[PDB]
Amino acid sequence: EEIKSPLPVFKEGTLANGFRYTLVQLEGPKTRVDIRLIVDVGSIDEKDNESGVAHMVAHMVFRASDAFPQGVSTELHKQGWGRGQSYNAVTNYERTMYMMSPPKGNLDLGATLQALSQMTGHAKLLQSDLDDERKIILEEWRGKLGVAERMNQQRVQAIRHDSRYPSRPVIGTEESINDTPASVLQDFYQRWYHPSNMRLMIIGDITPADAEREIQRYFAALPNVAVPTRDYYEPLLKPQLKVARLQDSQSGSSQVSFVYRFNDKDAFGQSEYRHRLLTQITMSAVTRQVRRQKAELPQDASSLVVRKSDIGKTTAALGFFANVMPGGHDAAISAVLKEIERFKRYPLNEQDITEITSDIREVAQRMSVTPETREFADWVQQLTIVWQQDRPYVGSQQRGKDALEALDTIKGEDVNRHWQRWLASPDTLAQFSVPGATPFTLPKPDAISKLQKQWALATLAPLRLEEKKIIPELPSVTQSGKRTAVKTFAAQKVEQWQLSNGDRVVWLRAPEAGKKVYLTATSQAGFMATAMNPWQAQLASQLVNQSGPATWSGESLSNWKKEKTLSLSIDQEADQLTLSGTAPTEQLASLFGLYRELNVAPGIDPDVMKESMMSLARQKANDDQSVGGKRASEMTKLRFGEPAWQQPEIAELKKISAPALLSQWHKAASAPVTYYLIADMPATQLLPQVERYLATIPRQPASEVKQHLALSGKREATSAINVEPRADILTWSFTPHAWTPQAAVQVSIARNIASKYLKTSLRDDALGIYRMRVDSELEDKKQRIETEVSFTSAPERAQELWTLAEQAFSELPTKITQQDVDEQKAQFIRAEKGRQGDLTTIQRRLILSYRHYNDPRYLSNASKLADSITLESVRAMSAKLYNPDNRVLYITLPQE
Amino acid sequence: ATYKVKFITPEGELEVECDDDVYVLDAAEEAGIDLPVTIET
Amino acid sequence: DVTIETH
Ligand SMILES: [Zn+2]
């Protein structure tokens, strides 16, 4: 919507059979319409023999119907609708929502209502259609497998314990998807899909009179049948201290939490709007304070946060969560409990409450006098949120007044009282995630309450106060170095400058830079450099990157960059160090100045370091026993023999100090740098800033870091270790080959042709291929064609896949046709011209040029690249993509 | 093939490494980041 | 969650 439309007119209605509808006429944009229907049934309503059936019905109502034996979605496809973009369904615990955006907007309204009434009142739910649809539902079930989903179920089981939700995931079970008969879906549909259990909303360019005549036409005849009464949406709250582990052997989660559960909709005889306003004020106040409380946490805990979430229609959960140093879960839960007790002892900061409520009053004041206007998609979002809750929309103008009124009856003592109610909830829960094989015994409730009593009896210091904001400033730099030499590449608009400290500038005066400067600073200081310690170097690089200069902080660094619209980022790879940044040209001194400070005055923010150590430790604990850690180790032994480096043991990790890490960083920062600078400005503007900030950094010659090169030969392994029901097939092949721009393009062209041929050659659905990837490139640093073919597939015929792809490769060089190359050449030509004037391409080719030629020639003559694409050259290169003498095969199968 | 993903949350910027054949949230969970290219939510 | 958006 380009012209925002004002607050719409709402018309509500109810047919005789109980069907409810909401008509929302916007004055624009012309023809746009959005149509949605909710059936108040979700997975929570399934019986024990109905697992996944709410969601299966949401699929099946698009198949055969009374009016459409070939399927509702079939009919829609024939009239130009696309799945997802034009029609969609979403099922959750409580409700099923059908959404329609007809291609012709409001002209298609009647066809949309005929389709929706067919879906909700006349679905056949045929066994034949279900047996066809099971393919799609099984595929969604497979894609919802993995560690994130498994941990989400761990969390639901704990935080919603004693409710219907843990046993009712929306997707259901593999057995139910495979085995549930259409008859069960029909009974579920006939139980819940009734007009008094359904509601419709139409938003946009409509005539409310016409629309509701269309609604009567398609929905009035549905028989009025009641659905069962339901009062099972909440966990059964009771006074308790429940203790749970959140556990998955592939999860790096290392975390403790303490949670209160309570009825969040009880407003205690007061305005319910005012109650939700007290909740917002309380959460903002607590969020401010609990961040300050980070200074009380011992080394085993970090990042104490408070979160509030809905866990039923009326129940909420208020949780305190903190990351844990693996092995330190006992000390961490005690620290969480101490901080909770401190919140029971002391009132919330009165200045915060004043500031928070004043901020809300300002917004509410502005809302109350501003006519509400929105774009179409925003109206749909705002209206759908309230309609899904089955509540009327209240406009932002009215809500602004409502807030001002409620704010007048809110004092600090109301906030404190609201907060203490949550902390007094008798239904409580302690949760532990402990990664990998870390020794752990689930504490008994008595052990947790023993800590609560300890802190209840202890003397606790007041809540921490807000600390003064650090306002960072770059130092004055008055030492200047000198440029000692200039080499000119006028044809490429490049100058190369030698500086007195040994650095060099490769400056490209590209008009495509506009009013910005682009910096890429490279040196040979990868973390495999011989003077360094690989894991410590990588940790130091990341900590300096996030912390900024010694006298700053992670957060003052982020604020300072934002203010100057400036970026600068450290990336230390195995073989090189790259600092990359952009600034406006008027910020050039601030970009070079920050760059210099990272080199000579690196910082380590203690909060950032503590968090980074937690992250490394929990991943180490997981990787030591996970599937992913096992695969990485076996792939390493197959391709390289031994790892180049490894993360430390956790006990060594815990000993790391800031001076040790800064020592590593200074080893990287001493390597001489080439500054690739893209800036459309005169040298007279650039050179003084170069000489002041970049020529003055101490350097010492560094050696080149040897590349990490996969070993030659044929090796294979098969590991039955997967925890999902899938096979992963990986093959690597390489051929040494000198890098030229022409050869790289030819490799790329043959790759595209090979991918399509290998995919066509493995088209058979009987093979069970879920995903398939063919990668190949002439890697320019290693100067080898590196080819990688990847499979994910059902386990049954995984052993055959690489064999079929191996045969495809041997056929490829005689199956490539003149038309294939002609298509690819024309497609390359079109891409190459879209890369003209592209700054990302220009910067990459400049840097590649210096790597191979030590000059910028690659910025010129790109129009001749396509000429190296011929039928002969592509076929001769397709024959090098796969080299049978250098082949490593790794097959991962499900565990026995 | 190594990549880096970033997530903007009401908690802060969270950065995660992610291979080609891994879903965004599986990588976060493997890394031990509690959530529910730089995306948004 | 948030009843009056501040950010
Ligand atoms: Zn589905």
Side-chain angles (χ1 to χ4, degrees), chain A residues 251 255 307 618 771 773, chain B residues 11 21 26 29-31 34:
Chain A
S251 171
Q255 185 199 69
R307 306 208 285 250
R618 64 189 186 232
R771 215 182 58 242
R773 183 173 40 101
Chain B
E11 309 275 293
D21 297 319
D26 287 337
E29 188 57 54
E30 205 193 23
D34 194 4

Side-chain angles (χ1 to χ4, degrees), chain A residues 381-495:
Chain A
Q381 283 162 1
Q382 298 314 304
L383 296 178
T384 310
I385 287 162
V386 184
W387 175 73
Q388 292 179 44
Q389 291 156 6
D390 209 346
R391 288 195 280 269
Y393 189 72
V394 180
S396 59
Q397 204 149 24
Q398 187 50 235
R399 225 84 252 228
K401 303 169 186 173
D402 289 342
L404 296 176
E405 178 188 12
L407 278 173
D408 285 340
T409 72
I410 290 174
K411 302 78 56 191
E413 73 166 339
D414 299 307
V415 175
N416 285 310
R417 178 192 310 114
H418 198 80
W419 176 224
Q420 294 299 326
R421 275 194 196 110
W422 296 348
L423 303 181
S425 300
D427 183 310
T428 71
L429 163 74
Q431 325 184 99
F432 295 84
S433 65
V434 176
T438 307
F440 176 76
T441 311
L442 193 71
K444 307 288 183 170
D446 275 8
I448 302 310
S449 61
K450 177 178 178 172
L451 295 168
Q452 309 182 111
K453 295 170 193 141
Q454 165 185 355
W455 295 126
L457 290 187
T459 303
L460 300 178
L463 297 166
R464 298 304 263 247
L465 302 188
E466 183 66 35
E467 291 209 300
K468 263 324 188 292
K469 200 63 73 182
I470 170 185
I471 179 63
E473 193 169 336
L474 289 174
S476 152
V477 173
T478 69
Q479 52 254 359
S480 278
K482 301 212 157 315
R483 170 178 81 180
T484 63
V486 168
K487 181 182 223 201
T488 304
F489 300 91
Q492 289 77 43
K493 304 184 311 204
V494 165
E495 303 190 358

Side-chain angles (χ1 to χ4, degrees), chain A residues 197-211:
Chain A
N197 200 38
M198 307 188 298
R199 63 184 180 279
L200 179 78
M201 177 162 70
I202 304 185
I203 289 157
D205 188 2
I206 57 168
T207 304
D210 296 335

